[PDB]
């Protein structure tokens, strides 16, 4: 299925992750990357809410 349980942006947070279209993000990275665009900068797909 999906990959490991980590945030692919900061590489170190592993608690309280929300699922992307195919992987996980931490809340801090989510609220930090929501301000640039709605597309996942890694998946090239829109981020859910």
């Amino acid at each position: 299925h999906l990959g490991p349980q980590f945030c692919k942006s900061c590489w170190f947070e592993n608690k309280g992750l929300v699922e992307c279209n195919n992987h996980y993000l931490c809340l801090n990275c989510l609220t930090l990357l929501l301000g640039v665009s709605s597309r996942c900068p890694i998946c090239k797909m829109p981020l859910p809410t």
Binding site: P4, F6, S9, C10, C29, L32, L33, V36, P41
Partner: protein, 1415 residues
């Protein structure tokens, strides 16, 4: 017995060459042993064929060089006695001949290099007598000739061999040695083991073998090894938890790493600097940096200068200085007449002007010398002081026009406008007369390419100054142009060495002065746009960061400053700093690192510029790796990795080779003196004492007291333990692992003056004279040939000590005396594998190289192939097989994709710390279940143990000079003390045999096998002690270890036990000779292997690496080969990470470099309009086809339709491949219309058919000092580029009559036609459009032109064969068999000198259609 004798006498009387000489040998033989004279007549036939083939006079009377020199009246002193086979005298030019025939390639190459040595000695000797000789070597590997038929000679040799079956010849004569060499000379061995040797091994072999067997068990059970491993691990963990063993692995803390990097160089760097102060200080740091950002505000003289430069190479007259003076007067008048009309002073600096040969001559000196010359000419006799100069100027211009007309320069092309010769020239020449930084330091923003453009202009000026011939104010100068101004770079020193340049202007005088090295500023010669664009790309990587947006501009300025700083100041210290930065950033994002990391990252920096670079790097990291970023670490890591790999922009060559050679010798010698085996003068004839020392050191090497001792393991100490070696051997045995005198007097007087030009004289005297008393032999004979010798040496030593039948006639014809006949425990009775040490350039640090003769080469090759066969039986290593390496890449991607732990290890001092004795020991204890072969490997490794290494002459000469200076006129190093102690007793180190030296390369596969088995055993021990599997991949220098899920969860839940296991791994590896280097890293995200980095299963681009590789690789070969090289490099780069824009810019930069060299760019060179599809699934031919389609957009469509129909009818239609091979050999221009009419497609009209391209290599290839398919299967970068620019201006192109001429002559003859238009598209593709009227009519220059449509069809068909038939759509092995079948003569000549399927078109479309190689 006389039956065969009379038979061969009849044979020689019937079949023999009776030209004028061999009848004498026949009558001298028939009165006389059969085999000897048979070989003698054969070799004499070879010799007469050699002297008649090389046009040399046969030397039959055994006359040496002294006889030849006495018969001509040349009196020479006592020199070397050598007799040639042929000689040729032409004035001061002698041609010498030496011939020999050898069956074994080893003996052949040995005699080749021996003849080379004797001939270079003879040339050096006769040079001291001013006699120029040219050598010639006739080495014939076969016995064939042109006097006796082949089968007749074979029958003769077979009769000799059948008469060798008797015993009377063997017992009466033919002693063992000479008879053996005679039998091997007539044999056909051509040496896979060659075991037919005389084994007389002494007891020392058994001593060494028993040394590898005592104490070691190697026959344990698979259960006891596990118990011993468990107990050792328990004791180790206990002693670590107590504290007697120091920890070697520390947890990573980003804050602590950043603080330790910032505090680096705290004793010389003040503190953290702001970006503004950095930009302020950068723009005024160095003179070259001051020149940048300084806000600095036809051509009749240039035409005359270039014209006189063109006629200067031909040596029109033996009046060198007078020619210079006349050309100076002419350029003076030209500049006067050009400056009066409309132009200002362009080539002036103030009381001095740039004359021919791009040199600055002061106007006052010109006036003075011309005045003296004209008055001296006027003393002899009326002309009124001006008719003389006018007449001589007419003579010079007439001679120049004649010397340029016979080659066809067509002087009118230079736009000289030859009216400047005035009758009032003398008067016009005599009446002619013309914090410390002058400008404002710092005005230009760091966003425009003005700084890069000025840097490119300066670098081009430097590299053009590098090539000044400097024949005979004397300061030379180059000129470099700019916008509203143009400047002059002045310099006095010549050559390719580093010198002191001065940037000057006419309006302000001197502007800058700096000591620079010319050959290093290459990657910035024309890199105007590619550098800015790659910096823009690197910034766009981290542009979408959302946390550095308020500072990204500062980041960009910083990066550009770093780039300009490393390009304007290429220093090896900067390269080392950037590589250590790479190591740091690699170890930054990991989980554990080595305690000695910071001591390795820190590198000694001087000159105050490297400190600025370090401050820039520190600020850049503080900006990108600030505490509050926590977003897209991948992009930032890639950015920093590229900033570190930016080191490639600097040239990898060494500034001065003496210092790097001393450094290499230091790295070579330090561990040996640290260990205690430095035996000097190995004394090939083995003595007992060296053997005693050898066996004692071998015994000491095996102690390596483990952790069970009192003190404990001494890390970084060479030695292997007996217990662990026994464990390894036992685990491998069972199924567990795999499952002049005046000069000398002047030097002495200069030394005396210095005590109470001369310095160089004293240095040369000490380097060439003191070494004579320690002659220990290339450089020794070189110094002896430059000098009576005995008396001078004795006087110098006193003055320095005061202040303190196997004959000869058959040896050159039948057999050789160079082959080993016996062998003992030291070597094959001829040499104990003597090597020579050299250095190989690399990016960070130079590597070592052991070069040996052919016998050593084949011995090491035998051992290498044996161990490679052994390793191929396994499936763990990845060194030279692409399949296992690809499998390793796949496994690494799979493991990293699941966030597993990865241990990237490098091993410090892998070369000097390994040992052949270790390999011998680990070999003698294995079983190798299925004696011949094994004893051979054993004795070969024993030979490797007794190894000689020749100390280079440069380093020993430097140490001798330093010793002399210290004895006559301070923290001496280890090697310095060693050399001084050796000199204090009289002996000089020539070879140092030791135990602890594995050759860097000569033992590659065996080292790989040893590393493989050892790492497999270590991983097995770890798995049995913890409960987790470990995969390993090695490359004989550094390796990767991939852990399973158990170790990952263990690290996640227990750091202490994990670090305990890691330190136990370190301890077991150090018990072997596997010293783990501090660069090692244990990281769960990034993985390094063979300079390949993996972050999330993907691969990092490493953009700057490929960009610098493309900007660097420019050789001096033929231009099409250069285009091929650049295309391969850009293909690789686009394949890995590089986008299309940078690669297009690199291609355009290469084309511009080629334009500067004045070359007729042809469309078959490069395609710089890429839209990236032809790099993923396209070859070079498809790219050239796309370029041509872009050139002529109409005919390409018709030809593509024709070829599409033809390919469709070929692949699955009527068979036509049988007649096309001959159809493609007729007239091409007619054949196109013929085939278009045959297929039904409308042929191209006359307009779109006359297009042709200029092929200078139509008759012969360019003389870059028959098809190309039959030939392909057979210094520095700046020097190469300047040589390319120099040849492409000289007589490079050849004519049909085998005559040389200039390209400018070809353009001139083209300009003498009324048909062509010379139209190019956008960047100078320069394709012609000659009409077909003059097409090959009267053998004119149209012969060089070649039609474009035919070659377009060739290339399109080639691509259709190679990669599918979709290429024809609208743009929206057995080859040698076919070569021999179609071209028999071409298959005979220039093919194999030392060595149905639908492919006949692939070989037929290039042997006639001279476009590319196509294969």
């Amino acid at each position: 017995m006389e039956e065969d004798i009379a038979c061969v006498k009849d044979l020689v009387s019937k079949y023999l060459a009776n030209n004028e000489r061999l009848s004498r040998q026949k009558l001298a033989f028939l009165v006389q042993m059969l085999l000897m004279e048979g070989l003698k007549l054969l070799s004499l036939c070879i010799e007469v064929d050699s002297c008649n083939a090389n046009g040399c006079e046969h030397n039959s009377e055994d006359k040496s060089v002294e006889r030849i020199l006495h018969d001509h009246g040349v009196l020479t002193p006592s020199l070397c006695f050598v007799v040639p086979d042929g000689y040729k005298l032409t004035g001061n030019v002698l041609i010498l001949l030496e011939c020999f025939v050898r069956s074994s390639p080893a003996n052949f190459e040995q005699k080749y290099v021996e003849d080379f040595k004797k001939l270079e000695q003879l040339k050096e000797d006769l040079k001291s007598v001013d006699i120029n000789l040219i050598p010639l070597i006739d080495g014939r590997t076969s016995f064939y000739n042109e006097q006796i038929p082949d089968w007749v000679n074979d029958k003769l040799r077979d009769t000799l061999f059948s008469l060798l079956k008797y015993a009377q010849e063997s017992n009466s004569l033919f002693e063992e040695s000479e008879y053996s060499r005679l039998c091997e000379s007539l044999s056909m061995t051509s040496g896979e083991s060659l075991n037919a040797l005389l084994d007389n091994r002494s007891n020392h072999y058994e001593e060494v073998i028993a040394s590898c067997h005592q104490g070691i068990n190697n026959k344990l059970t698979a259960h006891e090894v596990k118990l011993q491993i468990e107990e050792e691990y328990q004791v180790f963990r206990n002693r670590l938890r107590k504290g007697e063993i120091e920890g070697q692995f520390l947890k990573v803390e980003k804050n602590q790493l950043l603080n330790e990097f910032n505090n680096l160089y705290a004793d010389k760097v003040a503190e953290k600097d702001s970006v503004e102060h950095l930009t302020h200080q950068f723009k005024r740091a160095s003179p070259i940096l001051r020149f940048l950002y300084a806000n600095i505000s036809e051509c009749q003289m240039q035409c005359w200068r270039s014209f006189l430069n063109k006629v200067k190479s031909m040596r029109i007259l033996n009046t060198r200085r007078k020619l210079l003076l006349i050309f100076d007067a002419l350029i003076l008048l030209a500049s006067k007449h050009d400056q009066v009309r409309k132009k200002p002073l362009r080539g002036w600096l103030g009381t001095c002007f740039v004359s021919v040969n791009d040199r600055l001559v002061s106007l006052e000196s010109t006036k003075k010398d011309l005045k003296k010359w004209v008055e001296r000419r006027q003393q002899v006799e009326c002309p009124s002081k001006n008719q003389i100069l006018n007449s001589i100027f007419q003579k010079t211009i007439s001679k120049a026009t004649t010397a340029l007309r016979d080659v066809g320069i067509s002087v009118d092309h230079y736009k000289i406008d030859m009216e400047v010769i005035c009758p009032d020239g003398y008067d016009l020449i005599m009446d002619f007369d013309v914090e410390a930084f002058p400008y404002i330091m710092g005005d230009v923003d760091l966003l425009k390419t003005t700084d890069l453009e000025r840097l490119s202009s300066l670098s081009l000026a430097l590299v053009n100054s590098m090539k000044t011939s400097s024949t005979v104010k004397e300061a030379y100068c180059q000129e470099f142009s700019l916008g509203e101004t143009e400047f002059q770079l002045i310099y006095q020193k010549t050559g390719e060495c580093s010198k002191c340049y001065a940037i000057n202007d006419n309006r302000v005088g001197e502007v800058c002065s700096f000591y620079a090295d010319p050959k290093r500023y290459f990657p910035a010669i024309f890199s105007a746009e590619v550098l800015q664009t790659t910096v823009s790309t690197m910034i766009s990587w981290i542009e979408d960061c959302n946390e550095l947006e308020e500072q990204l501009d500062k980041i960009r300025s910083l990066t550009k400053m770093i780039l300009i700083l490393i390009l304007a100041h290429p220093s090896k210290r900067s390269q080392k700093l950037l590589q250590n930065l790479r190591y740091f950033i690699m170890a930054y994002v990991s989980d554990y690192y080595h305690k000695d990391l910071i001591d390795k990252v820190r590198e000694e920096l001087i000159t105050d510029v490297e400190f600025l670079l370090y401050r820039l790097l520190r600020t850049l990291m503080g900006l990108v790796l600030s505490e509050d970023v926590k977003s897209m670490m991948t992009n930032r890591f890639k950015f920093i990795l590229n900033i570190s790999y930016m080191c490639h922009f600097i040239t990898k060559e060494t500034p001065d080779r003496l210092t790097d050679q001393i450094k290499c010798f230091e790295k070579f010698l330090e561990p040996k003196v640290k260990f205690g085996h430095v035996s000097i003068n190995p004394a090939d004839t083995a003595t007992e004492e060296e053997l005693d020392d050898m066996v004692y050191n071998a015994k000491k090497f095996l102690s390596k007291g483990g952790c069970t001792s009192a003190k404990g393991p001494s890390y970084k100490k060479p030695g292997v333990s007996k217990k662990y070696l026994s464990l390894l051997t036992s685990s491998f045995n069972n199924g567990s692992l795999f499952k002049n005198k005046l000069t000398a007097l002047a030097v002495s007087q200069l030394t005396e003056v210095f005590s109470r030009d001369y310095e160089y004289k004293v240095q040369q005297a000490m380097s060439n004279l003191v070494l004579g008393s320690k002659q220990h032999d290339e450089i020794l004979l070189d110094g002896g040939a430059s000098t009576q010798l005995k008396e001078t040496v004795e006087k110098i030593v006193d003055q320095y000590r005061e202040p303190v039948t196997t004959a000869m006639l058959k040896n050159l014809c039948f057999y050789s005396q160079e082959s080993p006949q016996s062998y003992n425990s030291v070597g094959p009775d001829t040499g104990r594998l003597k090597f020579s040490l050299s250095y190989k350039e690399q990016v960070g640090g130079n590597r070592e190289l052991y070069i040996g003769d052919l016998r050593t080469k084949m011995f090491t090759r035998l051992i290498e192939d044996y161990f490679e066969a052994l390793s191929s039986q396994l499936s763990g290593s990845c060194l030279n097989n692409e399949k296992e390496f690809e499998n390793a890449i796949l496994s690494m991607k799979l493991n990293v994709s699941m966030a597993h732990v990865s241990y990237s290890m490098d091993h410090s001092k892998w070369g000097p710390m390994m040992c052949p004795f270790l390999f011998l020991t680990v070999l003698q204890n294995l079983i190798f279940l299925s004696i011949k072969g094994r004893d051979y490997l054993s004795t070969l490794l024993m030979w490797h143990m007794h190894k000689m290494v020749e100390i280079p002459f440069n380093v020993v000469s430097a140490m001798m000079k330093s010793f002399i200076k210290a004895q006559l006129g301070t923290k001496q190093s280890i090697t310095e003390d060693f050399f001084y102690s050796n000199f204090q007793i009289g002996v000089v180190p020539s070879h140092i045999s030791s135990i602890l030296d594995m050759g860097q390369g000569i033992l590659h596969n065996t080292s790989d096998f040893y590393a493989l088995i050892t790492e497999r055993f270590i991983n097995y021990a770890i798995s049995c002690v913890c409960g987790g599997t470990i995969d390993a991949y090695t490359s004989s220098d550094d390796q990767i270890s991939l852990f399973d899920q158990t170790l990952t969860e263990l690290l996640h839940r227990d750091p202490e036990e994990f670090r305990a296991l890691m330190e136990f791994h370190y301890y077991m590896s150090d018990q072997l000779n596997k010293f783990v280097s501090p660069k090692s890293v244990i990281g769960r995200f990034v993985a390094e292997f063979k300079s390949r980095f993996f972050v999330w299963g993907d691969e990092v681009p490493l953009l700057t690496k490929f960009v610098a590789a493309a900007l660097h690789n420019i050789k001096c070969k033929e231009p099409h080969q250069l285009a091929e090289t650049i295309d391969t490099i850009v293909d690789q780069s686009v394949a890995n990470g590089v986008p299309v824009h940078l690669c297009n810019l690199i291609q355009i930069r290469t084309l511009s470099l080629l334009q500067y060299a004045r070359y007729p760019i042809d469309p078959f060179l490069l395609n710089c309009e890429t839209d990236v599809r032809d790099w993923v699934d396209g070859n070079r031919s498809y790219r050239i086809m796309r370029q041509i389609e872009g050139l002529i957009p109409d005919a390409c469509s018709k030809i593509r339709s024709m070829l599409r129909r033809l390919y469709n009818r070929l692949k699955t239609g009527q068979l036509h491949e049988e007649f096309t091979t001959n159809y493609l050999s007729s007239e091409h221009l007619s054949s196109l219309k013929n085939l278009c009419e045959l297929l039904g497609v409308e042929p191209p009209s006359e307009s779109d058919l006359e297009y042709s391209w200029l092929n200078l290599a139509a008759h012969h290839p360019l003389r870059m000092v028959i098809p190309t398919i039959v030939k392909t299967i057979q210094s520095s970068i700046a020097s190469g580029f300047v040589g390319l620019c120099r040849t492409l201006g000289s007589k490079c192109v050849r004519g049909p009559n085998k005559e040389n001429l200039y390209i400018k002559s070809i353009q001139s003859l083209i300009t003498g036609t009324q048909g062509i238009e010379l139209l190019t598209n956008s960047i100078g593709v320069q394709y012609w459009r000659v009409p077909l009227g003059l097409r090959n009519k009267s053998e004119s220059v149209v012969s060089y032109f070649r039609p474009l449509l035919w070659d377009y069809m060739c290339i399109s068909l080639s691509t259709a064969i190679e990669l599918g038939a979709w290429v024809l759509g609208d743009p929206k092995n057995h080859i040698i068999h076919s070569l021999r079948r179609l071209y028999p003569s071409v298959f005979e000549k220039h093919i194999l000198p030392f060595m149905i399927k639908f492919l006949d078109l692939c070989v037929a479309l290039d042997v006639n259609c001279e476009a590319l190689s196509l294969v």
